């Protein structure tokens, strides 16, 4: 489009979160419009088009549930949907509900300011648009600002330079190239086996080794799909009533109580079945360091037995941090890749990168000559997208400033001093610790219900109570401190961005309990919010 001067609700972001908000707000009888930087819908599945890109949550879980028609119609094809497929899904939903007529594309919001006189937001874009809106919904993502390390050589590299979160829209040809991949999180583990098949030589620059387990992907049986469809709302209600927003089995035992022989036998069953459910095999894997370590060691042994050169294998073995505290990764022929002659593991812990050079990468041991260099170096997560926008609350406080020692929220949904502003599936909430379609739908519903409630009662200003926000922040840190999550440098704590404050940013109590807390809050008239 071309955006309206005035609107009840402005939404930023046209991925999963913004599309649903735009959908539900129209149903609720509210004027609403979306501004999005990308050329089209999809959010992470529009930007992340690198080869091998693929979801780690089963296709049947990772999908919308607000529309029965969508659930009956869509045909998923495999256990874990590839990126192109998930993008076809999102295009399908966008077409079905005519969503694009409410979205300005190619447009980046740059500043937003709350106006105490009118109880409204004024939102500016990089095209010179100015929009006035009663409420502001930031659906701008969790993993939406690419993080490029500030390596000394970078702007001098004479080859082709890429980042997996901003991938060309036409396939890139690596045939006969020497190619370097920096980063071995889920992006790098998924991209490298694809590049390994085209490149003359592939150098995988690893820092901390991450734990990954086999995906065991497979065709989805069309019979099973037809069968699921008969009870689809029931199946999703079951997933909503869990810590993780999926059908993972919640292992009741402690990893410490079991004999060696029972532990091997349980873990081996998880490993053969494939997928991430091993994380919840015993109740204390994320709570107790001796529990965690008996599982970790099982995993490190599978890695040693997968790679034939034991020197290379040992370099791949994760050390230094508890299993499950960086995101657990699903791999498809990633370890086996290192048995190819043309694939090299460069351990940068023992040989740190000193600089990028015109021809390649220099570590303390040698220089590597490369035609292309792929950064799988992640995202300035959870706060990176909000921080790129000049957002100003009451008394002209900048959000960037209030949150400079870490995000401060009530329920993650709002921050005090910034009335009428909501963050979708961000810091202070379950967010990426659960299936994100479950986190996102529940936030979009709770916020849009809240906005409908304000118009219904002729209220115009919603603001979190400062003391409740402070209590909520404290609570989030205290329950996080009963787990091993804060022990490790991950994007969850911000420790991947130099200078970023190190605080575990997510609610760890599980989706289900959080959902309960949010319903209790709404049921009592939005206790902990002041409305006028
Ligand atoms: C490659 C990858 C794979 C994933 N795999 C899974 C999975 O297996 N499990 C899981 O549960 N989740 C996974 N995620 C997490 C993912 O973030 C969520 O599942 C979900 O897609 C987030 O949707 P969103 O709408 O909340 O944000 P996004 O998908 O990131 O959408 C936000 C949009 O806002 C736009 N935007 C940002 N700032 C501005 C601005 N200033 N002005 C205008 N527009 C702006 C962005 O361009 C983006 O399009 C994955 C993440 C990535 C990066
Ligand atoms: N399959 C999927 O469903 C999928 C795919 C991609 C992304 N995602 C989501 O998005 C998240 C991020 O994935 P990601 O792989 O893009 O990023 P990541 O998990 O943040 O990993 C970034 C990688 O780059 C390395 N790195 C960062 N800075 C570096 C530096 N200065 N020098 C050398 N190495 C550096 C990190 O090393 P260290 O660990 O040593 O810091 C790590 O190996 C995932 O955890 C998941 O939530 C999901």
Swiss-Prot record:
Record: residues binding FAD: 17, 36, 44-47, 56, 62, 109, 142, 436
Transmembrane intervals: none
Superkingdom per UniProt: Bacteria
Oxidoreductase is among the record's keywords: yes
Assembly notes: Monomer.
Family: Belongs to the FAD-binding monooxygenase family.
Function: Catalyzes a Baeyer-Villiger oxidation reaction, i.e. the insertion of an oxygen atom into a carbon-carbon bond adjacent to a carbonyl, which converts ketones to esters. Is most efficient with phenylacetone as substrate, leading to the formation of benzyl acetate. Can also oxidize other aromatic ketones (benzylacetone, alpha-methylphenylacetone and 4-hydroxyacetophenone), some aliphatic ketones (dodecan-2-one and bicyclohept-2-en-6-one) and sulfides (e.g. methyl 4-tolylsulfide).
Name the UniProt record assigns to this protein: Phenylacetone monooxygenase
Species in which this protein is naturally found: Thermobifida fusca (strain YX)
């Amino acid at each position: 489009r071309q955006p309206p001067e005035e609107v009840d609700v402005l939404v930023v972001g046209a991925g999963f979160s913004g599309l649903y908000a735009l959908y539900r707000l129209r149903e609720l009888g509210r004027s609403v419009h979306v501004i999005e930087t990308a050329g089209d819908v999809g959010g992470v599945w529009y930007w992340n088009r690198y080869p091998g890109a693929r979801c780690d949550i089963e296709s049947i879980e990772y999908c919308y549930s607000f529309s029965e028609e969508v659930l009956q119609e869509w045909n998923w094809t495999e256990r874990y949907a590839s990126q192109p497929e998930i993008l076809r899904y999102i295009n399908f939903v966008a077409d079905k509900f005519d969503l694009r007529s409410g979205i300005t594309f190619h447009t980046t919001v740059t500043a937003a300011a709350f106006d105490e006189a009118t109880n409204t937001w004024t939102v500016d874009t990089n095209h010179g648009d100015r929009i006035r809106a009663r409420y502001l919904i930031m659906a701008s993502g969790q993993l939406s600002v690419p993080q490029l390390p500030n390596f000394p050589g970078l702007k001098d590299f004479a080859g082709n330079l890429y980042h997996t979160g901003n991938w060309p829209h036409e396939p890139v040809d690596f045939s006969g190239q020497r190619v370097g991949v920096i980063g071995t999180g889920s992006s790098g583990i998924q991209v490298s086996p694809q590049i390994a098949k085209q490149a003359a030589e592939l150098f995988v620059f690893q820092r901390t080794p991450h734990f990954a387990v086999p995906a065991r992907n497979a065709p989805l049986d069309p019979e099973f799909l037809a069968d699921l469809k008969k009870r689809y709302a029931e199946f999703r209600e079951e997933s909503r009533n869990t810590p993780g927003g999926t059908h993972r089995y919640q292992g009741p035992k402690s990893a410490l109580e079991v004999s060696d022989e029972e532990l091997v036998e349980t873990l081996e069953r998880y490993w053969q079945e494939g997928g991430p459910d091993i994380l919840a095999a015993y109740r204390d894997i994320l709570r107790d360091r001796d529990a965690n370590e008996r599982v970790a060691e099982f995993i490190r042994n599978k890695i040693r037995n997968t790679v034939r050169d034991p020197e290379v294998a040992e370099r791949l073995v994760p050390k230094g941090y508890p299993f499950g505290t960086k995101r657990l990764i699903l791999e498809i022929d990633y370890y086996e890749m290192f048995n190819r002659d043309n694939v090299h593991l460069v351990d940068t812990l023992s040989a740190p990168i000193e600089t990028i050079t015109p021809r390649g990468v220099r570590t303390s041991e040698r220089e590597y000559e490369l035609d292309s260099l792929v950064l799988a170096t992640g995202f300035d997560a959870l706060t990176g997208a909000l921080f790129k926008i000049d957002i100003r609350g009451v008394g002209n406080v900048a959000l960037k400033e209030k949150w400079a020692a870490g995000p401060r929220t009530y329920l993650g949904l709002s921050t005090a001093g910034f009335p009428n502003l909501f963050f979708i599936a961000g810091p202070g909430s379950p967010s990426a610790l659960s299936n994100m379609l479950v986190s996102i739908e529940q936030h979009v519903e709770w916020v849009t219900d809240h906005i409908a409630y304000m118009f219904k009662n002729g209220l115009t200003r919603s603001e979190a109570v400062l003391e409740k926000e402070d209590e909520w922040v404290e609570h989030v840190n205290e329950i996080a401190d009963e787990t091993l999550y804060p022990m490790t440098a991950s994007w969850y704590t911000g420790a991947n961005v130099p200078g970023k404050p190190r605080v575990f940013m997510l609610y760890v109590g599980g989706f289900h309990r959080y959902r309960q807390i949010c319903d209790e809050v709404a049921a009592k008239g939005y206790e902990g919010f002041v409305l006028t």
